[PDB]
Amino acid sequence: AFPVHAAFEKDFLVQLVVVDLNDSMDQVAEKVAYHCVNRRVAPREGVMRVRKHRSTELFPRDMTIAESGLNPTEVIDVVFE
Amino acid sequence: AFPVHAAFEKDFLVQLVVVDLNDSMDQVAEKVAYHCVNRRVAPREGVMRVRKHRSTELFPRDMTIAESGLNPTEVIDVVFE
Amino acid sequence: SFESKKPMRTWSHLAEMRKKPSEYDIVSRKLHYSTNNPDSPWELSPDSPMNLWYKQYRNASPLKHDNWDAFTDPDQLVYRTYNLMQDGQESYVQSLFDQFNEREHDQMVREGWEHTMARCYSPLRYLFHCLQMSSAYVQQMAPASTISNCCILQTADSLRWLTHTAYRTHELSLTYPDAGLGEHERELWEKEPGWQGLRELMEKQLTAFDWGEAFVSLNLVVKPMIVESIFKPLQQQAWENNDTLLPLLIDSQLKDAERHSRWSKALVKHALENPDNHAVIEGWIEKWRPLADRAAEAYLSMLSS
Amino acid sequence: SFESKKPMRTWSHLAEMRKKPSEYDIVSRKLHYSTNNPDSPWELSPDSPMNLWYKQYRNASPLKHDNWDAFTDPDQLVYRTYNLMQDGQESYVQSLFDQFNEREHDQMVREGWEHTMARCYSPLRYLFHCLQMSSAYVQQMAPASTISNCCILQTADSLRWLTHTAYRTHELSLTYPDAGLGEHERELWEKEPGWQGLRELMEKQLTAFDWGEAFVSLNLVVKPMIVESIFKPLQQQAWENNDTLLPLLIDSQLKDAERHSRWSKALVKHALENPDNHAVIEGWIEKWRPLADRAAEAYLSMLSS
Amino acid sequence: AMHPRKDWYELTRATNWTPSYVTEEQLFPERMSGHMGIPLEKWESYDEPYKTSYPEYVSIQREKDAGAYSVKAALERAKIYENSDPGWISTLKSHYGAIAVGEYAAVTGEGRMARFSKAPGNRNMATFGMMDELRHGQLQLFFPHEYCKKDRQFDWAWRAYHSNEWAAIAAKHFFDDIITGRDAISVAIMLTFSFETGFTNMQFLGLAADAAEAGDYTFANLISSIQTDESRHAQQGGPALQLLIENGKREEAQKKVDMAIWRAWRLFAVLTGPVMDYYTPLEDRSQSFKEFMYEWIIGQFERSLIDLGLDKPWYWDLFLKDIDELHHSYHMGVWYWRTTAWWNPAAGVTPEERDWLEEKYPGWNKRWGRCWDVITENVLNDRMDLVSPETLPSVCNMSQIPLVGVPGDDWNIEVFSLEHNGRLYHFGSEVDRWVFQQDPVQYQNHMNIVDRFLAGQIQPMTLEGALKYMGFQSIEEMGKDAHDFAWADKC
Amino acid sequence: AMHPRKDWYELTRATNWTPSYVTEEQLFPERMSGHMGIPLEKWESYDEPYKTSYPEYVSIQREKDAGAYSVKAALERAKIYENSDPGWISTLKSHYGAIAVGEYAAVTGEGRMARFSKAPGNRNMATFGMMDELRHGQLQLFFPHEYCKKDRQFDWAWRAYHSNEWAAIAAKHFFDDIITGRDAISVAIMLTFSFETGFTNMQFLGLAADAAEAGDYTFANLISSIQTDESRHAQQGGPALQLLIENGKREEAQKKVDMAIWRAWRLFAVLTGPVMDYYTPLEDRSQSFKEFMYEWIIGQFERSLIDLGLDKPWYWDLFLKDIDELHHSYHMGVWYWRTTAWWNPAAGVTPEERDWLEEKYPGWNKRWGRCWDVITENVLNDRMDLVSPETLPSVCNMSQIPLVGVPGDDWNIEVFSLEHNGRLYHFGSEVDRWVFQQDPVQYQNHMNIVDRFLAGQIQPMTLEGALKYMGFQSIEEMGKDAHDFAWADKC
Amino acid sequence: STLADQALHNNNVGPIIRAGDLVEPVIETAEIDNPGKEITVEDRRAYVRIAAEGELILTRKTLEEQLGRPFNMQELEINLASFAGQIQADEDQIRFYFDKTM
Amino acid sequence: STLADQALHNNNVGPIIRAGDLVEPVIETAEIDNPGKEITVEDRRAYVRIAAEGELILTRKTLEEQLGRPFNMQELEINLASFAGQIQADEDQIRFYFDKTM
Ligand SMILES: Nc1ccc(C(=O)O)cc1
Ligand SMILES: Nc1ccc(C(=O)O)cc1
Ligand SMILES: Nc1ccc(C(=O)O)cc1
Ligand SMILES: Nc1ccc(C(=O)O)cc1
Ligand SMILES: Nc1ccc(C(=O)O)cc1
Ligand SMILES: Nc1ccc(C(=O)O)cc1
Ligand SMILES: Nc1ccc(C(=O)O)cc1
Ligand SMILES: Nc1ccc(C(=O)O)cc1
Ligand SMILES: [Fe+3]
Ligand SMILES: [Fe+3]
Ligand SMILES: [Fe+3]
Ligand SMILES: [Fe+3]
Secondary structure (H helix, E strand, C coil): CEEEEEEEECCCCEEEEEEECCCCCCCCHHHHHCCCCCCCCCCCCCCCEEECCCCCCEEEEEEEEHCCCCCCCCCEEEEEE | CEEEEEEEECCEEEEEECCCCEEEEEEHHHHHHHCCCCCCCCCCCEEEEEEEEECCEECCCCCCCHCCCCCCEEEEEEEEE | CCCCCCCCCCCCCCCCCCCCCCCHHHCCCCCCHCCCCCCCCCCCCCCCHHHHHHHHHHCCCCCCCCHHHHHCCCCCCCCCHHHHHHHHHHHHHHHHHHHHHHCCCCHHHHCCCHHHHHCCCCCHHHHHHHHHHHHHHHHCCCHHHHHHHHHHHHHHHHHHHEEEEEHHHHHHHHHCCCCCCCCCHHHHHHHHHHHHHHHHHHHHHHHCHCCCCCCHHHHHHHHHHHHHHHEEEEEEEHHHCCHHHHHHHHHHHHHHHHHHHHHHHHHHHHCCCCCHHHHHHHHHHHHHHHHHHHHHHHHHHHHHC | CCCCCCCCCCCCCCCCCCCCCHHHHHHHCCCHHCCCCCCCCCCCCCCHHHHHHHHHHHHHHCCCCCCCHCCCCCCCCHHHHHHHHHHHHHHHHHHHHHHHCCCCCHHCCCCHHHHHHHHHHHCCCHHHHHHHHHHHHHHHHCCHHHHHHHHHHHHHHHHHHHHHHHHHHHHHHHHHHCCCCCCCCHHHHHHHHHHHHHHHHHHHHHCCHHHHHHHHHEEEHHHHHHHHHHHHHHHHHHHHHCCHHHHHHHHHHHHHHHHHHHHHHHHHHHHHHCHHHHHHHHHHHHHHHHHHHHHHHHHHHHHHH | CCCCHHHHHHHHCCCCCCCCCCCCHHCCCCCHEEEEEEHHHHHCCCCCCCCCCCHHHHHHHHHHHHHHHHHHCCCCCCHHHCCCHHHHHHHHHHHHHHHHHHHHHHHHHHHHHHHHHHCCCHHHHHHHHHHHHHHHHHHHHHHCCCCCCCHHHHHHHHHHHCCHHHHHHHHHHHHHHHHHCCCHHHHHHHHHHHHHCCCHHHHHHHHHHHHHHHCCCCHHHHHHHHHHHHHHHHHHHHHHHHHHHCCCHEEEEEEEHHHHHHHHHHHHHHHHHHHHHCCCCHHHHCCHHHHHHHHHHHHHHHHHHHHHHCCCCCCCCHHHHHHHHHHHHHHHHHHCHHCCCCCCCCCCHHHHHHHHHHCCCCCCCCHHHHHHHHHCCCCCCCCHHHHHHCCCECEEEEEEEEEECCCCCEEECEEEEEEECEEEEEECCCCHHHHHHCCCCHHHHCHHHHHHCCCCCCCCCCCCHHHHCCCCHHHHHCCCCCCCHHHHCCC | CCCCHHHHHHHHCCCCCCCCCCCCCCCCCCHHCCCCCCCCHCCCCCCCCCCCCCCHHHHHHHHHHHHHHHHHHHHCCCCCCHHHHHHHHHHHHHHHHHHHHHHHHHHHHEEEHHHHHHCCCHHHHHHHHHHHHHHHHHHHHHHHHHCCCCCCCCCHHHHHHHCCCHHHHHHHHHHHHHHCCCHHHHHHHHHHHHHHHCCHHHHHHHHHHHHHHCCCCHHHHHHHHHHHHHHHHHHHHHHHHHHHHHCCCCHHHHHHHHHHHHHHHHHHHHHHHHHHHHHHHHHHCCCHHHHHHHHHHHHHHHHHHHHCCCCCCCHHHHHHHHHHHHHHHHHHHHHHHHHHHHHHHHHCHHHHHHHHHHCCCCCCCCHHHHHHHHHHHHHCCCCHHHCCCCCCCEEHHHHHHHEECCCCCCCCCEEEEEEEEEEEEEECCCCHHHHHHHCCCHHHCCCCEEEHCCCCCCCCCCHHHHHHHHCCCCCCCCCCCCCCCCCHHHC | HHHHHHHHHCCCEEEEEEECCCHHHHCCCCCCEEECCEEEEECCCEEEEEEEEEEEEHHHHHHHHHCCCCCCHHHHHHHHHHEECEEECCCEEEEEECCCCC | HHHHHHHHCCEEEEEEECCCCCHHHHHHHHHHCCCCCCCCECCCCCCEEEECCCCCEEEHHHHHHCCCCCCCHHHHHHHHEEEECCCEECCCEEECCCCCCC
8 A cells, every 4th residue: 555646637636546556657547547537637538647746757657656666645647648 | 616525436535626606516527527537436337426425315417516505615425326 | 846956965954054964963953843833833723722832931932033943052962972971970970879888988977967968968859850840841842952952961960860869868878767868858848948948949930931931040040059059068068077979979960060051051142142132031030040049048058057 | 423413502512501501601611722632732743832832831730620611700701791891890980080180189188198109009000010911821821711711801900900000100290290100110110129029029920831820829829919918008098198089999900809819719619629739729829928928018018118 | 789779769759749839730730731630649659660760771772772873884885775675765765754853742742741740750751751752853863864865855854844745744733632732641641651552563663574574674673672762651651541540530531542542543544554565565564554453553552451441442343444444545545646745655556466455455456456457557558647636635634634435346435524613624534523522622723735725825726836835845855656657567 | 181092101011121030031931922132122112003092992892892793683683594695604604613713812822922022012902902802702603603503514613623624724723823833923923914914804804895795794794893903903013023123133024924924825715715706606706806815915915014114025926826826726625525624615616607707817717617617517417426535635734725736728736845854745835835944843743634644543544534533523514515516507 | 353352352461572682582581481371472573572371571580591691670671672461670570461361 | 917016016095994884984084184185995895995195194073073973083993994004093183104105
């Protein structure tokens, strides 16, 4: 269990989403979208990506949060390519 | 000039109508109707008659108020046969 | 014929004032409609008994002015401000009563003072009630509402004084139950010589039905006499007898009495706009002053006994 | 889990009373949320400076009770009724000031009384302000809103007394401009021996930061001393010197002082529900009484000079 | 400590004494005192049941005004004037005009008692009564005054009693008869007992209920506060009544009550009746006029009258029938001759209102409805000339109000006439004629508006001449239909 | 005669003296007094510009309450509760809950000054200040109390500050920081100057304007009367400010003002912003939130700040942008997580309202409108599960409010983070992080709701567990959509 | 006149309280101080008509308790807009009553 | 920030009067006691914002005249809900003013 704070593209806030130490930037992006898409954000085409908050670099879609070196409660964004 | 108080059949009040000493119970009835019929009373068929207020006897349609012995400001009704 | 007109900023009768109408102007001025028709003050048969009364005792008064309504209470008091003012004065007096009772003031007065109070003070309730009745008469007969209003407040002040006296008579009797306090006042008012000048004065005054004579006798003659010959000597006697409450109480009553004299003087000034009124007023004062002086001498003689 | 519940007729915390909640209950009870979390009185870092202050000087006080909030002002005063009551008392005092000034009271005091007032009365403004500051401290530290409310009103009463003193100091100087009235009070408070016991007492009292010791020292020790050793002797001296105003003024101030003692005694009764508190309270009284007695002796010695 | 009022109150009213320097009759003349020969000593039994004293009075009354004025101040921006139904505005105009200066007149009624009553308790309570009416006159000038700048008809709050306008004459003929024109004991019985425990509850509390429904809290709060004073000083009447009965004067007492109640009824029927059943918006009618009558006059007042030992008035049955009928006709008269009023009468006969009226007064549509049918038609056809009068109504010589009856299907109207000293007088009921006959010197030489018109006192002898005579000072002041006839559109 | 206040006033504040038996620092400890080393003698220059004295205070304040209470009494039957828009009722619930016991806390701020300020004039004015806040706490408990019997959410007028509910924690973290948690001089500057001349005008007068439009005069009259006291005791701040500047402490003064204004802004944006632009019925919006800000904060307050000799805050431009944006997002957060509120948020996004919002905030529909579009859809399709949260929002470590940004077309959101003593903290702006860094000992060991949740203090770790932790005591108390979603029907 | 007869033949006594802070407390006081009497209340918004058969007492002590603040009996006048029955008042209570039974 | 700049750069001073009996009299008083100053009034129903450039004086004497009843300056506090400018008050008048000109 790994708590993070996630800002989903086009939403209005940052939320606490609890992911797992072994999830990939595809699974994390999915867990975040759950609390956003079809709630305050319209669903769309494209691939959901994860980056450290306001970072220029995206995490590889396959990397786990463990491999990412993120610390718990650190902030991330979820955007579209 | 001869002031009387006149209550017209089906109206709601008594009014001051000034007639002339020489008018007949046809003319008086006409002068009263003027301030009543088509104002608060619906027009109708029949002959307009004049009697002393609440009297059982009607004045002849031809008698003048002078001949009637009425005193000024005395009360009269105007009803239909 | 008729014209179309703008709304006025105040009553039609005040619309020409060159100052914004005050609360006093708005609620006090020109309210006696009974002065509109000389022939028939009241809306009844013109010769009904009360119409005849008013035509004789108001309209036909020798005290004459073409615009009584222009009179102004120099204090411009209205009901609302009267109560504010008097709740202030009366709360203070009641606080004095409470505080002096707590400190057992009455026990410490000079020996026998209780008897002087029972004879000279407690029967004042009759005198003050006479002032109350008389003030009400002037109220109902005065030719302008601004005058009558002053009289209404003065009637209330008279009852105020009456009430002070009743309260203190009773209170004093709790310390001095063997002096006749609250028991013999009527007999004193009726039989005691020191009271007879005053009683004769008021009985006759109460039968002066002309509004002008009523006003002059009451407010210019009787009431100032009471200030100078009753209120102030009582204060002096109280001082000589270690009564420290009465002088304070009377100072509060004296505030009312100066107010009555203040509006009275203003009415006189207004009336004297008519040069004829000087002789009228002067005559009524001369007529009543001897009775007033005799009332005062008898009272003072009794106070000093 | 959660349940559906009916609306309550009053606040949830008063809903079990077997009497209808009064105005006092509704607006006064259980308003200090700062007593909810022992670890962190205020919603900040639990070791912030004010949190440490409160944990030491309130929470850790040796004066202990499991339900301080159950305390009740025996008078059940709220802001609204305090102002009604004090507007009554204060209007009366102001009326006394006005009336006694009108009658030139101050001119008639015994020769030299002005000097006794300048030395013994006017510097009271410093003493009363100390009471004011101290009352505010007890207010901010007390463990229940019903206690703090009594302190708030007491702080206002202290300023009331301060204000009386300032007013009369100035007024007296208008008749006696060569006695140092309104000029030398600070120096007297600082240097005059008769004031030094009192000044030492208050400076030390104001540095007693435990809420319980603050309360006991102020309301059980200092304030009753002032009643018996300052207020009442002053009345006696005023009487001996034909000052009739001061005794009346002080009687009004004494009403406030009895009220403070009345709620203080009630708090003590509440605290003594805990048998442990008897020794605590008794100890603080013994600790402070000598300073209080010395303050009183020095003052009285000076009053009698 | 303070001593309780019960321990010193008797001394406040121990003020009767035996005159020696003038006679008892000179000091209390019958024409002003009305003691009916009852000696001074008997009057000391008078015991006012609703006491007060000077210190309590000023304190309490200060509190009463603080609330009245604070509420007015907090609600100045509620836009009652702009946003209220104009029928409601006319209700305010009518009330203030008909009442403010009448209140001030009532001071004189109280003063008559304060000076001339032989009962010491009555003289003291009348003193507070004088003060109360002063309050009431000043309140009811102060409140409408702010509306002068909006509407000239509000000037009548002050002007009405100074005019010869018909409702002002009706008001003064009544008030001058029972308030300012009679002896102290008559005032105690006719004013404080009959009028003030009898009818004022209707206008000051019944109307307040409608005002609260209308959302006009300034006004409801005002008049309900005013009536708290009435509740106290009105209690001077009962003990005078009881004293008269104990001293063998029950017939005299009964006749005064009978007279005053009927006189009050006719006036209330022309002012309060139309307000409650027509001017007040339908959704704001807490109860009908009749329902309020049954609450306040029958259920409360008449029951109290019986409890004190008096009898139902001889005219009881006529009164009950009148409650069903009179005001409907008075309303019609006020509205048809609306141009002579200082307020704007609402016709109040939209279909929705006629349904309510039929429910509250079964058979209404077959009666007054017949006339409103004719009226409504002329309006839907722009014959506005037939909706304005070209003569005077016949006016009662007692109440100064038009002579009316039941119109329509079962038409019935009766005038009760009287020759007296060579003059012919006309009354709208047996009771009004009876009242005249009880005291002809009071009434015989009074001339109503019609009399004056026929005597040549109103010139020119035309509608405009009469409006001028009535004191109107501009076009705006003259009464018109409250809704500018917009109610016709619901028809 | 009486002598005028100007002749004896100086003696009322001639109360400073030179301590001899304890030291000056023992008598006025820096942690409680905050004199910044300025010697006693310099503080005697302090001159409160809005004076009063004890006799005037009790008399005037008696009059203030008489009006407040009289008005409440006269309007009890106006059916505000039953007849008002539920958005308006929620505005009352929010106000009373967030304010009443906070007012009572402000007594302690004033008391801190009354005891510990070195300025004698400040100690006396703070004494009236203690009294004023006592009035305000008691008024704002007394008024809502009558509604307990109608609605359990009104119990929060008393309960809120005793709970760990999120808005209560936000309110206490702010008030404990600027009112009860700092030295006397800090209180003078942060509370009486910054918060009280700066923002309270918005909530107590801006909201009163909306209340008057809504026809709730009891409430408008109440809070506007309350602010008359503020106007006087708030004037303790300016002269402390001027004294600090004169004595070389301008930087310290500027920083305190800067800190307090921003802290106040974030709280006002989450409570007053949604009230003015969403809860208050559209027809009752006297001005928009931004417009009121420009009137009260920019036009009045910031101009006064400059006049006294201070500078615009360094964060001026961020503040202006925030005024355009922040509250729209705060509203959305309060509403989405409405179940954790003690009032019932109104969504306030009917087409008519969105038009107003677009006019008041051009580009709104392309931003917040995008989220409300999604929300509105779920409601029109009974997917109510998507309109309730299944996690926590990320919460600021300063303001205790969710971390937000601009949604929609030009999405932009920024969190400002900080490692401190091994712990990671998150702030919703540069200014909030700056505030923390100004005084870490004040804040560092505080834990917000999210922190507590992650530390295991909230059990069970579910929506119900959190609601229990927040002090809710029944289903009724939990916040819901004000109109039960009926607004969707306009869509 | 059967409607009118029924209206007249009542023995209802009690205060009419104008809208304000005394309405609820007076009703509660009427219920408490007259146990075993049925208290009727007719609400006209601007005032409330409170009644009992034959007699209805309001004590100062109960009214003060129900009102929740210090209260003197004479203050009731601030809100007593009218009353049915004859009145007997003092510092401790007010009594509304009839001498006759109809 | 041009809107914000324009809002800040004002010299408006004067009382904000809460709805009640002081609104009209204070506006009239502002006009009378500051001749040759333009008085601006913004009406928010619950309060009115009254202003002049640089300085605005209200004298007790004029306010008393415009209010129409006896009035002491300290009573203004009953209705002075806020104010722009610094304040200088005494028994004879209140002055609202700025030290700077923006
Ligand atoms: N009271 C009256 C007033 C006027 C007239 C009249 O003008 O004839 C008659 C009586
Ligand atoms: N002020 C605080 C209150 C509570 C907590 C916590 O529960 O961890 C932390 C800080
Ligand atoms: N128009 C009137 C209004 C009131 C009264 C009264 O209270 O006696 C009398 C007349
Ligand atoms: N009650 C009246 C109504 C109207 C008239 C009239 O128009 O002359 C006279 C009296
Ligand atoms: N010609 C006239 C017509 C009507 C009236 C009137 O209503 O008073 C008077 C004269
Ligand atoms: N919640 C609060 C309300 C008011 C005040 C204040 O006036 O200082 C402070 C806090
Ligand atoms: N500001 C907050 C809003 C909501 C929550 C929560 O639902 O836990 C916490 C904080
Ligand atoms: N599982 C949870 C979902 C939501 C919340 C919350 O909003 O506080 C808490 C726990
Ligand atoms: Fe009246
Ligand atoms: Fe009356
Ligand atoms: Fe406050
Ligand atoms: Fe404040």
